[PDB]
């Protein structure tokens, strides 16, 4: 198994929250 | 004040405290049961703390409310992490709106499916079009695809 990174995990983030203020 | 709660959620998220963000999001969901942004943040918190089945259960308990504002990326990501690669593929292909996040996961899904020719085309595009802190890692992924072809 070559080295392979789960880069999708770095995209797991809250949506923009400004409007909820 | 629910704006005050959202300020709390944002502060915790920015500092990476998804454990406390989850607690606050759950308080918001006690007030606004169908707030799509709150459900989205809850899913993110759960994924960030490794609770992939719990995150998927949130998505699948709120299907209608989440429809087309939806978390196809997050749902497919959980399916991917739960050894459900065929589900993950179908969720990606069924997404109403394609995104950079979906394309990143799609490349990883194609790699796990040993669809290396399609995977290589995806990673060439991801490498060219991405500007982030993970170029070295993404080029390592691309090299793994090239190696699998040979
Ligand atoms: K964590």
Domain B1-150 homologous superfamily, CATH: Tetratricopeptide repeat domain (1.25.40.10)
Q: How far is B89 from B149, CA to CA, in rounded Å?
A: 21
Is A20's CB within 8 Å of B140's CB?
no
Is A21's CB within 8 Å of B3's CB?
yes
Radius of gyration for the alpha carbons in chain A, expressed in angstroms and rounded:
15
Q: How far is B21 from B19, CA to CA, in rounded Å?
A: 6
- State whether the Cα torsion B27-B47-B126-B133 is positive or negative: positive
- The residue extents of the domains of chain B are 1-150
**Total Cβ atoms within 10 A of residue B103:** 19
Chain A, chain B: beta-carbon pairs less than 8 Å apart: 69
Q: DSSP per residue over B83-139, as a string?
A: T-HHHHHHHHHT-SS--HHHHHHHHHHHHHTT-HHHHHHHHHHHHHH--STTHHHHH
Q: For chain B, how long is the longest CA-to-CA vector?
A: 60
Question: Looking at chain B, which residue has its C-alpha nearest residue A7?
Answer: B104
Q: Would residue B134 be called left, alpha or beta, if left means φ above 0 and alpha means ψ between -120 and 50 degrees? A: alpha
B120 to chain A, closest Cα gap in Å: 14
């Amino acid at each position: 198994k070559p080295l392979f990174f789960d880069l999708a995990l770095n995209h797991v983030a809250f949506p923009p929250l400004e409007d909820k203020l | 004040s629910v704006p005050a709660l959202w300020s709390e959620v944002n502060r915790y998220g920015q500092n990476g405290d998804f454990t406390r963000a989850l607690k606050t999001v759950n308080k918001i969901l006690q007030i606004n049961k169908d707030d799509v942004t709150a459900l989205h943040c809850k899913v993110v918190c759960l994924i960030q703390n490794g609770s992939f089945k719990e995150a998927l259960n949130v998505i699948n308990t709120h299907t209608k409310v989440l429809a087309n504002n939806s978390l196809s990326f997050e749902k497919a990501y959980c399916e991917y992490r739960l050894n459900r690669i065929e589900n993950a593929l179908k969720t990606i292909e069924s997404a109403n709106q394609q995104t950079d996040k979906l394309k990143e996961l799609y490349g990883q899904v194609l790699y796990r499916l040993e669809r290396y020719d399609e995977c290589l085309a995806v990673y060439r595009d991801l490498v060219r079009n991405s500007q982030d802190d993970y170029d070295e890692e993404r080029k390592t992924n691309l090299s793994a695809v090239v190696a699998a072809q040979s």
